[PDB]
Design a protein around this ligand. Structure first.
Ligand SMILES: O=C(O)c1sc(Cc2ccccc2)nc1-c1ccccc1
Length: 188
């Protein structure tokens, strides 16, 4: 077939019921995640190929970067709670990987302040149980799929994208193949 289990995607041996339709995992410490966001814009190109108002979810992971990696999962929970993902994603990537100016939870906070989130509002969210619950959702979802690597994408809790078997000589063709595969998987 043109799409083959084991090739463009793997199929979850233990499928995860009641999982989000399109679920991506990333870390601000992961270089390929950096590219998926700023160079390839995977998420928006997947979104443009899927039906209206499909639910796309994106979660940070703890298993890279030690203490600060776990701080970033809580900060991503803040970003989700406030709906400011689009304003902090690039400066967080650049602060961790480009300028290496993010060394502490305070440095993470400066990124939200600079992006226009009020200091009071960031701190209330950071300390909120709504955010603690978002942190728990992120960890649980990663545990449900025994995640050990990013970037990762899962469709309908049953199929995992496998980009390692895709031609990467042309960025635009790669993105299109990634997005068309997700669409194919969502339609199964
Ligand atoms: O496997 C690889 O080498 C590449 S390349 C890439 C972005 C890109 C595409 C085309 C040209 C330049 C960059 N992402 C990955 C990747 C690696 C491991 C897990 C998930 C994705």
């Amino acid at each position: 077939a043109q799409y083959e289990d084991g090739k463009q995607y793997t199929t979850l041996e233990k499928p995860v019921a009641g999982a989000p339709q399109v679920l991506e995992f990333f870390s601000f410490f992961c270089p390929h995640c950096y590219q998926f966001e700023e160079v390839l814009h995977i998420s928006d190109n997947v979104k443009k190929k899927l039906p209206e108002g499909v639910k796309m979810t994106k979660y940070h992971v703890n298993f890279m970067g030690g203490d600060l990696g776990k701080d970033l999962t809580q900060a991503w929970a803040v970003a989700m709670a406030l709906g400011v993902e689009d304003k902090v994603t690039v400066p967080l990537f650049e602060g961790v990987q480009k300028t290496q100016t993010i060394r502490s939870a305070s440095d993470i906070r400066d990124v939200f302040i600079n992006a226009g989130i009020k200091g009071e509002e960031y701190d209330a969210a950071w300390n909120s149980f709504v955010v603690k619950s978002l942190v728990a959702q992120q960890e649980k979802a990663a545990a449900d799929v025994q995640l050990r690597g990013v970037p990762a994408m899962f469709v309908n809790g049953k199929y995992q994208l496998n980009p390692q078997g895709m031609d990467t000589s042309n960025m635009d063709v790669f993105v299109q193949q990634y997005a068309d595969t997700v669409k194919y998987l969502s339609e199964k």
